[PDB]
Design a protein around this ligand. Structure first.
Ligand SMILES: CC(=O)N[C@@H]1[C@@H](O)[C@H](O[C@@H]2O[C@H](CO)[C@H](O)[C@H](O[C@]3(C(=O)O)C[C@H](O)[C@@H](NC(C)=O)[C@H]([C@H](O)[C@H](O)CO)O3)[C@H]2O)[C@@H](CO)O[C@H]1O
Ligand SMILES: CC(=O)N[C@@H]1[C@@H](O)[C@H](O[C@@H]2O[C@H](CO)[C@H](O)[C@H](O[C@]3(C(=O)O)C[C@H](O)[C@@H](NC(C)=O)[C@H]([C@H](O)[C@H](O)CO)O3)[C@H]2O)[C@@H](CO)O[C@H]1O
Ligand SMILES: CC(=O)N[C@@H]1[C@@H](O)[C@H](O[C@@H]2O[C@H](CO)[C@H](O)[C@H](O[C@]3(C(=O)O)C[C@H](O)[C@@H](NC(C)=O)[C@H]([C@H](O)[C@H](O)CO)O3)[C@H]2O)[C@@H](CO)O[C@H]1O
Ligand code: NAG
Ligand code: NAG
Ligand code: NAG
Ligand code: NAG
Ligand code: NAG
Ligand code: NAG
Ligand code: NAG
Ligand code: NAG
Ligand code: NAG
Lengths: 163, 322, 324, 163, 322, 163
């Protein structure tokens, strides 16, 4: 992807995180677990649903072919009719396929971007208080309990407290 | 090891694949097919209303009353009309239907006729009205179109015909009539007595004077003679006037246009499916929530939009890592 | 207390909105509307050239010279033609105009006619030329088309007509003539004497032989008879030759095609707006520098491109989100 | 948008910077103020203006409907004519609406990208000499006077001089 | 002095430029032109099959046998047909060709006729069969179309003609005939004796009866008279029957339709180019692997797709720094 | 571009790097050299070649004009025919020109993105073991020989060995 997070520095996705699209895998003395990020996953569903519907709705006034009959001595207008109809059908087939292709790429890049943004949201919060592994992982210098993990996920983490 | 938190994304067992510009067959966690690819292979009622299935009859055969088309003497209201590519029962007596395609176009906006008598058989006291042909069999015997009358001479005489019909109905009226093209001068006098004939027809807008054409012609349905049929829409309160001294295939029945709306003439070899649908194609009906389909371009009803595509799948989820 | 520098972006009080694929009603600092949505509701001159407003007359009524259309006997140069959907003054004497739509197509490429007398009404010595009808009233008296002549028998005789006109002008000439279809045989002889008639017309390209159609027809404008009109374009130095022994509606005036260019026949109910525009539609004129408009698909002049959109707005500035 | 700066780490826009689209707020001992970054703003103005002209100029060969008249027995071609003209009007209405939509999205992402790029341009200059706060601001370890602030905006900030 | 690794990208000597929405004339390291802009200015064989170059003759002139078109009496199979914009040799005797455009349309699906005799000159025992016109010169003397015959009265009589031809061939047959419209009544009797005349033509589908039109007309090619030509397709096993008592321009030769396929009638002033191509336009042939071209919209063969673009260039490489 | 690498922090391209689209310039005691990165260059070639083929294949069923003739009294249908044919040619000319412009923009952004991703791959691999000058280069603390430069490109680079 264009943002280098999905199939980038994060080597692969998690089978164990069947919770949401983007999330965390925390570890401390109390244990370890998977938790999805609510703001970013919800943002992703809304943007993607809006995309699907916009694509359907832009095609709403597509061309509709009508059966027309012509006699043995109206071959020129018969052929004109056939080419005009096939013409619009071809134009709208192209519009449909191309839109799907272009937006599919933007969708996958959109996901990649959200993971990247989520990585930065954590990094800019922790700063000097945690080591950056490059794996998609941050190693805490100090102890981060379950309530501390809540502060990272919620975005309520307090820097001057640990620095 | 001290405490840690990692950022990551969803992976599942999905093998669903989408395409992009730079890449084909990309595995995603979630995808959405938006293309309907199946139909029921039947001709169905459209939203509770049965189509008119003309079977082996053409529109011409139906309206003129080809005796082989008696099933369709008084059809109920229809949602759409189905006609075969090559209906066997058409103009039983050989010839043609003037502006036939333009008539069929009008039909596309009509859902129901009510057939009425406009000139009774009893009207013809000075002419023979029982003209038949072996080109138009009924029960294997010589007969004729039901809705028009073949007038011939009586007592070696064909006096000038004058008939009027005033449309006192509130609906537009489809009126049909024809001219007979005989084989030679001898046949002309044998049937109509008068050697030089005409049919004049007038309304408020129509001004027509037809003259028969003798030509030496190949046999079609056993007959070298020809009939050429004409039509007009007679407005409420207008009147149609016929005058002729021979070769006149006169109206008997005409059609009140009692229901107009969305309809079509569908070309199909299929017949009635004893079935109901919201969207019909000439090759089968569609029951779908997809925004697109690729069944056939000619549909009627509430339908997905047609595309020529074999495949349309949108990515919804993300790239599914191995 | 320690010094610092921040990176940021512009915000303002804008409530302008634009749409994208993934979201709608996005508030932006600046936006550019590119859709013209207004018009003046008038029919105006095009680039200083006045249109031809036909009022209650049709093109047929104008060209043949329906007495109700005397306003349009010798019209000046026009930029476009305006015609109502159902003009009251058309073929006063009922009938039809052969290849009428093809004639109207030709008009779309014409800007001016010079109408000329080609066969004087007074030049008919062996025929009556004063035929009138109550179907074409003028000042409450039976009249007739101004540009063609109703010929009938004189002294119970209708001798064969042979008339020629050679186009000695340098412009193409639009020539009009017609045939009268009577009610019955008695009326035929009463008007034209000869029971069996024809009109033959020939040019370098035209080879026409018309025969009247007697039929019993409904009254239209009080008359059951019909007149069928025909036309041709006579090239410079070519000649038109008429022959007839009855039912001939002869040309009197014909039209020199003097200015050819871009024109159109617009369908509209509006009248003249004492106004000038670069872009005209059937419902109003456009004075805009927008690239698009949604007024009406049929326009003439220098115009924005027509689209069916209710809204087209480009984002130019950025996502407007002021700190609170 | 996709680049996570606009409504990202820099939480909101400045109404106080009436100067350009992207820029700086500084505060030192001499005082404080906003200043637009001249090149990136002029860069963006150029790209957006060109985009607008390209959209307009690409449509210039659009379809133009012509009034055509048909008689009572020319209904098939009348319908053909109508469906053809409506056909092109729908095609071009789609092209216009869709282009505007896709390009509105690119325009907003373009701005988001430009801010991100501007933030990085400063970040790579300052390095060890300033603390990255994460809100779009950098806190200086040394004193940075007006001429020092100007060199940061310039891209002429001298690293070895203060470290 | 200390070690360092840098990240960077490719630059080269390219001055290739591409366009984007936001930027024009962007210099890139690599680009791919996809628009063919050149043609050979020649009319060539299409995939080894020579075209039919009608030179100064029209399709009318060719088929009817305008004496100036003898070059084309029995042409071999063609890949496409070339006609000039205003061919000088058309209807030498002035008049018109009925449904000419519909005939030319059929030609667009035909690659070869085989011309055959359907009514020999030896058939005409009671009529003169050598009528000519100075409007149809050949070698500076009056002549006539080669494929149809001008019949006139013999011994001051024109007895009624009855002629039939049964299509015993396996191929459809293009049949041509005409009517002569005289200058006046004296001319009518002078050529045909009978003052009131007709031509009736019948097949299984054709029902025609023509009557000549006397009118006073301008001289075209020296003559005020006119000939109007008609045509039908005669199916295998069908027969055509002519009957006439004057003004009949009778068939002599007709055309078996022996090869059907892709063809076209191109308008061009160009002459034959003694070359071969796989893609031809009216202004020159195209030899290209480009997906698009801008030469001319009307092409035949395996061709790139036509666009109106003056330039189409895709970026492949990256932005090239000076 | 959108990713701020090509003509961003990396001021220019290298004439000396003939081997690929993206790579490295190193400087050690053994001698300075140019080495292109194998995967990212190959990935880009596959992506760009496919983009080209997709564009060609989508235009595969464009409109094809056919010569039709009309007589002196078929002017309306002649005009109708002409406008219909011109109409589709304009539509497909538009489609071809627009797709190319849009995909040209995406291709340049793609390269720009690929450059950034390669820079970050080096950045996250090095971390503390190297300095960041900000011009797309990394100053080593320890004298890195040819064997050190090799491990970076492969991804073999052992961080614990050098820290
Ligand atoms: C080899 C041979 O000569 N055999 C004759 C055979 O031709 C003839 O048959 C009659 O031929 C006439 C044409 O000359 C018609 O084809 C007759 O058929 C009908 C028909 O079915 O259409 C009979 C019908 O009663 C007639 N109806 C009316 C209203 O007139 C029609 C009608 O005349 C024509 O269709 C008009 O074109 O014709 C057919 O019986 C027989 C009988 O004479 O004798 C053989 O030896
Ligand atoms: C109920 C009844 O029988 N009333 C008749 C009444 O019809 C008749 O009026 C004349 O009727 C004839 C038709 O038979 C025409 O309609 C006459 O109208 C005119 C017209 O105005 O168009 C008169 C006009 O002077 C005529 N002009 C010429 C050049 O001939 C034309 C023309 O002949 C026809 O239109 C051709 O089709 O007709 C109308 O006067 C009256 C008077 O006779 O007597 C009642 O008893
Ligand atoms: C100055 C003057 O009046 N001179 C006449 C002169 O017109 C006349 O020439 C003949 O005129 C007739 C028409 O009246 C034809 O135009 C003759 O031309 C031909 C032709 O070449 O087409 C001669 C030809 O042999 C005829 N062929 C047949 C089969 O009949 C045709 C044919 O009749 C017409 O084309 C039918 O429309 O006409 C032309 O020679 C001369 C000689 O008679 O006498 C002068 O006094
Ligand atoms: C695939 O995953 C789903 C859960 O998302 C699970 O229910 C299903 O059993 C799995 N299928 C197979 C074949 O393993
Ligand atoms: C993947 O793409 C190939 C060729 O592009 C195609 O044949 C196939 O249908 C796709 N899916 C497979 C092989 O499962
Ligand atoms: C038909 O009858 C109505 C009512 O009797 C009458 O008013 C009308 O004039 C008639 N129509 C014609 C064409 O005579
Ligand atoms: C926004 O500010 C401008 C002054 O620059 C003012 O004209 C406009 O009314 C304001 N909009 C409001 C207050 O809604
Ligand atoms: C904004 O969009 C919504 C639907 O997306 C619509 O209902 C509303 O009218 C729009 N405009 C407003 C509220 O000004
Ligand atoms: C018309 O007149 C001109 C000039 O006198 C003459 O040359 C020409 O032949 C005439 N045209 C016809 C068709 O008679
Ligand atoms: C550009 O470089 C290529 C090889 O890299 C060389 O063959 C060519 O001559 C050069 N072109 C110019 C115009 O210098
Ligand atoms: C570069 O683009 C301009 C338009 O921006 C054009 O006029 C020019 O011809 C192009 N190429 C050149 C000068 O080589
Ligand atoms: C033509 O000839 C064939 C075979 O001799 C015959 O069967 C057929 O009926 C004939 N066609 C006509 C129209 O007479």
């Amino acid at each position: 992807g264009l943002f280098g997070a999905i199939a980038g520095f994060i080597e692969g996705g998690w089978q164990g995180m069947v919770d949401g699209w983007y999330g965390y895998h925390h570890s401390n003395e109390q244990g370890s677990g998977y938790a999805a990020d609510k703001e970013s996953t919800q943002k992703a569903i809304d943007g993607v649903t809006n995309k699907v519907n916009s694509i359907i709705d832009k095609m709403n006034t597509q061309f509709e072919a009508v059966g027309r009959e012509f006699n043995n001595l109206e071959r020129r207008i018969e052929n004109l009719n056939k080419k005009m109809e096939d013409g619009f059908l071809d134009v709208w087939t192209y519009n449909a396929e191309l839109l799907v292709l272009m937006e599919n790429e933007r969708t996958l890049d959109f996901h990649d971007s959200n993971v990247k943004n989520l990585y930065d949201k954590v990094r800019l919060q922790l700063r000097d208080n945690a080591k950056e592994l490059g794996n998609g992982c941050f190693e805490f210098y100090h102890r981060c309990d379950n309530e501390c993990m809540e502060s990272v996920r919620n975005g309520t983490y307090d820097y001057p407290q640990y620095s | 090891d001290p405490d840690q938190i990692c950022i990551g994304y969803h992976a599942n067992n999905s093998t669903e694949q989408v395409d992009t510009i730079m890449e084909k067959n990309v595995t995603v966690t979630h995808a959405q097919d938006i293309l309907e690819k199946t139909h029921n292979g039947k001709l169905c009622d459209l939203d509770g209303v049965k189509p008119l299935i003309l079977r082996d009859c053409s529109v011409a055969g139906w309206l003129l009353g080809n005796p082989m088309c008696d099933e369709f003497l008084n059809v109920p209201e229809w949602s759409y009309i189905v006609e075969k590519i090559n209906p066997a029962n058409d103009l039983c007596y050989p010839g043609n239907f003037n502006d036939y395609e333009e008539l069929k176009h009008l039909l596309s906006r009509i859902n129901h006729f009510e057939k009425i008598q406009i000139i009774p058989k009893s009207s013809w006291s000075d002419h023979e009205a029982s003209g038949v042909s072996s080109a138009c069999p009924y029960q294997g015997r010589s007969s004729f179109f039901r809705n028009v009358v073949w007038l011939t001479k009586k007592d070696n005489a064909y006096p000038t015909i004058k008939r009027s019909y005033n449309n006192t109905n509130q609906e537009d009226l489809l009126v049909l009539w024809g001219i007979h093209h005989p084989n030679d001068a001898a046949e002309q006098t044998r049937l109509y007595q008068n050697p030089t004939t005409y049919i004049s027809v007038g309304t408020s807008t129509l001004n027509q004077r037809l003259v028969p054409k003798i030509a030496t012609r190949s046999k079609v349905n056993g007959q070298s003679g020809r009939m050429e049929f004409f039509w007009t829409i007679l407005k409420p309160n207008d009147a149609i006037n016929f005058e002729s001294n021979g070769n006149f295939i006169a109206p008997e029945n005409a059609y009140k246009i009692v229901k107009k709306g969305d309809s079509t003439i569908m070309k199909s070899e299929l017949e009635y499916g004893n079935c109901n649908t919201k969207c019909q194609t000439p090759i089968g009906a569609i029951n779908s929530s997809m925004p697109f389909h690729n069944i056939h371009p000619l549909t009627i009803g509430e339908c997905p939009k047609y595309v020529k595509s074999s495949r349309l799948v949108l990515a919804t989820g993300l790239r599914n890592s191995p």
